[PDB]
Amino acid sequence: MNLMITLLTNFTLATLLVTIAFWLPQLNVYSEKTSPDPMGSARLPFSMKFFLVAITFLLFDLEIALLLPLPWASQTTNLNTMLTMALLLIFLLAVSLAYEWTQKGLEWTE
Amino acid sequence: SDGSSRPYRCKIKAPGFAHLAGLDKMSKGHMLADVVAIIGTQDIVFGEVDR
Amino acid sequence: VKQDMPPVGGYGPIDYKRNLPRRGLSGYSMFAVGIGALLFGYW
Amino acid sequence: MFMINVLTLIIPILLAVAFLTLVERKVLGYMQFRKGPNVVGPYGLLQPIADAIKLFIKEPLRPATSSISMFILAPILALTLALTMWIPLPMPYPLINMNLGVLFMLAMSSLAVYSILWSGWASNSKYALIGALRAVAQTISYEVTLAIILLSVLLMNGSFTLSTLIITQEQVWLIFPAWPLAMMWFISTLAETNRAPFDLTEGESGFNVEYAAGPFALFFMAEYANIIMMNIFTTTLFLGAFHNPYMPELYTINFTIKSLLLSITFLWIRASYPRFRYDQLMHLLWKNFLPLTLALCMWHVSLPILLSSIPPQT
Amino acid sequence: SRGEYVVAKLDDLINWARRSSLWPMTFGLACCAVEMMHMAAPRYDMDRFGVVFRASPRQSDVMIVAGTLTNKMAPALRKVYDQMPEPRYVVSMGSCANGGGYYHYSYSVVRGCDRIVPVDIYVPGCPPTAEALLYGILQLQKKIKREKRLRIWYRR
Amino acid sequence: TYKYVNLREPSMDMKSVTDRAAQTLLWTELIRGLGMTLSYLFREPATINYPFEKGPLSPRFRGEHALRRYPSGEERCIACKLCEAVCPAQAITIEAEPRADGSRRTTRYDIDMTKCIYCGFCQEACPVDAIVEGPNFEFSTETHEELLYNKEKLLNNGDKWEAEIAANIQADYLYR
Numbered sequence: 119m120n121l122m123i124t125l126l127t128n129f130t131l132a133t134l135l136v137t138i139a140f141w142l143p144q145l146n147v148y149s150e151k152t153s154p155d156p157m158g159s160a161r162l163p164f165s166m167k168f169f170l171v172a173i174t175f176l177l178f179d180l181e182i183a184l185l186l187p188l189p190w191a192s193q194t195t196n197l198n199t200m201l202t203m204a205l206l207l208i209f210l211l212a213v214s215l216a217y218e219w220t221q222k223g224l225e226w227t228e
Numbered sequence: 229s230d231g232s233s234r235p236y237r238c239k240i241k242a243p244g245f246a247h248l249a250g251l252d253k254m255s256k257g258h259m260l261a262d263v264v265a266i267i268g269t270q271d272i273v274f275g276e277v278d279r
Numbered sequence: 280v281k282q283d284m285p286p287v288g289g290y291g292p293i294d295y296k297r298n299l300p301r302r303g304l305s306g307y308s309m310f311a312v313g314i315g316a317l318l319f320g321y322w
Numbered sequence: 323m324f325m326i327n328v329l330t331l332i333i334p335i336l337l338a339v340a341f342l343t344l345v346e347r348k349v350l351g352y353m354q355f356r357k358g359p360n361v362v363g364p365y366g367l368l369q370p371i372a373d374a375i376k377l378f379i380k381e382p383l384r385p386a387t388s389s390i391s392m393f394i395l396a397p398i399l400a401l402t403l404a405l406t407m408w409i410p411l412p413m414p415y416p417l418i419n420m421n422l423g424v425l426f427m428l429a430m431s432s433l434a435v436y437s438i439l440w441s442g443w444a445s446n447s448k449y450a451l452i453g454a455l456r457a458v459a460q461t462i463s464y465e466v467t468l469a470i471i472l473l474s475v476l477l478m479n480g481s482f483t484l485s486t487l488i489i490t491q492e493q494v495w496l497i498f499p500a501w502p503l504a505m506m507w508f509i510s511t512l513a514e515t516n517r518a519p520f521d522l523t524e525g526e527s528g529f530n531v532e533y534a535a536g537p538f539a540l541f542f543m544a545e546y547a548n549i550i551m552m553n554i555f556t557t558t559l560f561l562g563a564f565h566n567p568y569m570p571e572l573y574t575i576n577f578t579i580k581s582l583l584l585s586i587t588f589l590w591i592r593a594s595y596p597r598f599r600y601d602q603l604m605h606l607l608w609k610n611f612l613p614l615t616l617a618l619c620m621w622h623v624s625l626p627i628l629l630s631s632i633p634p635q636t
Numbered sequence: 637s638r639g640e641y642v643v644a645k646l647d648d649l650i651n652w653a654r655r656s657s658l659w660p661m662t663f664g665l666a667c668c669a670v671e672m673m674h675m676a677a678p679r680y681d682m683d684r685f686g687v688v689f690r691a692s693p694r695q696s697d698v699m700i701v702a703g704t705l706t707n708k709m710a711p712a713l714r715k716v717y718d719q720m721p722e723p724r725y726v727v728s729m730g731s732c733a734n735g736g737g738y739y740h741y742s743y744s745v746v747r748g749c750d751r752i753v754p755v756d757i758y759v760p761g762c763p764p765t766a767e768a769l770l771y772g773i774l775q776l777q778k779k780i781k782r783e784k785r786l787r788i789w790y791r792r
Numbered sequence: 793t794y795k796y797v798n799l800r801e802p803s804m805d806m807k808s809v810t811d812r813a814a815q816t817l818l819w820t821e822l823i824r825g826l827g828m829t830l831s832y833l834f835r836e837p838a839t840i841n842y843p844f845e846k847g848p849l850s851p852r853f854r855g856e857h858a859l860r861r862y863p864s865g866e867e868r869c870i871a872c873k874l875c876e877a878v879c880p881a882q883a884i885t886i887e888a889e890p891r892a893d894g895s896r897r898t899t900r901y902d903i904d905m906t907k908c909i910y911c912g913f914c915q916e917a918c919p920v921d922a923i924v925e926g927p928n929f930e931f932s933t934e935t936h937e938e939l940l941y942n943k944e945k946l947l948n949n950g951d952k953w954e955a956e957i958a959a960n961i962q963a964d965y966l967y968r
């Protein structure tokens with residue numbers, strides 16, 4: 119109940135501040151502006167590099183999720199198996215990184 | 229000079245006028261942020277470029 | 280006459296060379312300090 | 323009674339970030355042979371108040387946004403995740419004592435990029451969209467390296483509880499067995515909050531240029547609160563203080579001094595180096611930081627096993 | 637009465653807040669921009685007055701026209717001025733921005749920037765010294781200080 | 793008569809290469825830059841307290857224009873139109889006629905302070921030291937037409953700043 123109260127308090131302070139910032143000088147009287155950036159008429163061209171680093175982040179994030187419970191897992195009784203599996207997980211992460219390195223995957227966003 | 233007390237023609241050759249013409253050649257194959265260094269590595273003052 | 284002139288002995292020497300001090304320990308000593316801190320922390 | 327605790331948590335955050343703007347201007351100015359503001363108040367103590375009242379009475383921009391929902395919602399999420407993220411901090415006792423406070427802070431760190439994404443989308447200028455995409459990519463990459471470094475340090479600690487970090491650092495600091503992780507963590511938190519030399523939107527466009535004076539001020543408050551809290555997190559994680567259960571004010575004063583020094587170090591780093599390029603900071607992460615992070619992660623997985631130094635779960 | 641005193645104190649408060657936090661947007665056109673950067677130097681230090689260095693044009697209060705405004709440049713200046721939030725002020729620095737100066741009779745020079753934007757403070761010189769531009773900024777602060785917006789609103 | 797900047801071959805022995813590896817693994821030069829900035833923090837800043845303190849100036853300084861007088865009340869200018877002939881910006885407009893006592897005096901002496909480039913050719917072309925550039929520089933106005941000085945304004949400026957202009961001329965005139 120304390121966490122929900124704190125979340126609600128932070129949220130209501132945030133929207134009170136946003137409403138004040140967005141509406142307090144609206145009641146002032148001024149003059150309006152016309153409806154009109156280097157690329158206004160040009161369309162946005164696709165770039166493969168940003169999407170590639172996005173998916174690389176997603177895959178490394180998934181392997182981070184797999185690697186995360188190691189502090190809890192270090193208190194086990196099969197210490198040899200736990201050490202082997204942890205080292206194998208980080209080794210496969212490094213292998214994926216090196217294979218992305220070798221095949222020019224990290225190019226122009228290195 | 230035409231023999232009078234005023235110049236007939238006074239052409240000003242500036243170092244920055246010819247350097248800015250080579251900006252397109254020097255910035256070929258470089259990034260957007262590398263261009264602002266090239267305009268910096270040529271000491272360009274636009275009082276002398278445009279005269 | 281009285282004119283703005285240098286003194287009769289001339290001005291003093293003026294340095295103009297690049298002077299970087301070359302301070303600090305070597306790479307071996309820096310690495311040894313790093314491993315020593317690591318070993319103390321581990322112990 | 324608990325709402326009093328919440329208010330005494332959240333109002334000093336706003337006071338601290340306003341005087342952090344003042345301290346930034348003064349310390350930055352004195353490092354380049356001039357003074358900071360000293361005319362508005364006595365030694366410029368009234369400068370943030372004047373700036374706030376000026377910014378809250380300026381005419382709003384009213385941009386031609388494609389969507390108004392994202393335009394409103396981005397400061398909402400930014401301020402909410404800036405202020406919610408302070409609650410599990412053990413100073414020396416947290417507001418909310420949680421079992422997985424580190425995971426909570428990492429989750430809000432991952433969640434904070436939606437403000438950048440929605441601010442970039444809501445603005446009608448596509449150049450702002452490109453800048454927002456680059457900022458999002460930088461933030462998520464350094465999120466990855468933050469997660470791995472935090473995992474290794476907590477594997478030394480043994481549990482996700484943030485208050486246990488005070489107990490595990492009673493004898494010696496964790497900067498002594500984990501100084502490469504400390505250096506890389508500091509640089510990663512520097513690059514997380516778009517701090518120099520890793521800011522890009524100031525150099526050659528911004529994602530939040532289209533916002534009015536008020537919403538820009540709110541984004542500034544969120545960013546500076548993130549900076550202060552990240553320095554406090556680094557202080558708790560690596561430079562823990564001596565805690566006496568009968569005098570908590572000793573720990574409060576000690577870690578306050580340490581986090582103040584770390585924030586001054588942030589401003590000090592801002593006024594020393596030129597700006598990175600975008601591809602250069604990608605090269606710094608993916609080709610320099612990540613292999614060392616994985617190697618040190620393997621080392622810190624295997625080190626407590628071979629030294630009989632496994633920490634307790636509780 | 638009570639209301640006149642209240643609006644007078646509120647006007648004084650908002651005047652102090654506006655005049656003590658000026659954020660300028662310079663125009664780096666010509667010589668006078670170099671003298672502006674010499675005013676931002678540690679000797680004179682505009683930043684101690686609350687006047688920040690190189691603010692964004694989207695959040696700036698005062699525009700400083702420092703240089704020569706040509707015919708090829710004036711629509712861009714008008715666009716920048718039109719995209720600036722009120723309350724806004726324009727400071728003309730140097731002879732070129734005031735009345736054309738050396739290039740007054742030129743075919744491609746706007747004879748004064750007051751033909752494009754309304755100017756509050758005229759700083760004379762070629763270039764006017766950094767002390768002169770700082771004095772002009774302080775005079776603009778005095779001009780903002782004696783504003784009477786809320787008194788006019790209450791009286792109307 | 794020439795030197796080769798950036799033509800240094802670094803040593804390939806183990807000591808120098810280990811020093812380089814320690815430099816790029818422990819950030820030595822970044823610490824050097826931090827130390828430079830930290831040392832520059834503890835120096836006294838060069839910021840003066842304007843307007844209570846003013847920058848140093850020489851008696852050759854060219855500021856606001858003024859029209860001087862003889863030490864009897866008679867104005868120095870005798871309408872010779874040298875200043876308006878030498879003015880590069882054509883800021884000076886002079887109209888003259890003989891007055892009641894028959895002296896050669898001006899009837900209109902305008903200086904356009906928005907045209908003037910503050911070059912000091914008028915004060916060096918004057919044969920009687922009538923027009924001078926005074927030491928005043930804090931004279932910014934709020935209206936464009938206030939920067940259009942006529943004869944009366946320049947005479948008032950001369951009567952206002954004579955006590956300093958005379959001292960500056962006395963200190964400087966031996967170099968002319």
Ligand code: SF4
Pocket residue numbers: 666667668702703704729730731732733737738761762763764909
């Ligand atoms: S007024 Fe003089 S110094 Fe200023 S831009 Fe014009 S020519 Fe240059």
Ligand code: SF4
Pocket residue numbers: 875878879880881882883884903907908909910911912913914915
């Ligand atoms: S200082 Fe030069 S430009 Fe100004 S009035 Fe005298 S001669 Fe003309």
Ligand code: SF4
Pocket residue numbers: 868869870871872873874875876886914917918919920921922923
């Ligand atoms: S040069 Fe001197 S005497 Fe001649 S018209 Fe000008 S101010 Fe008068």
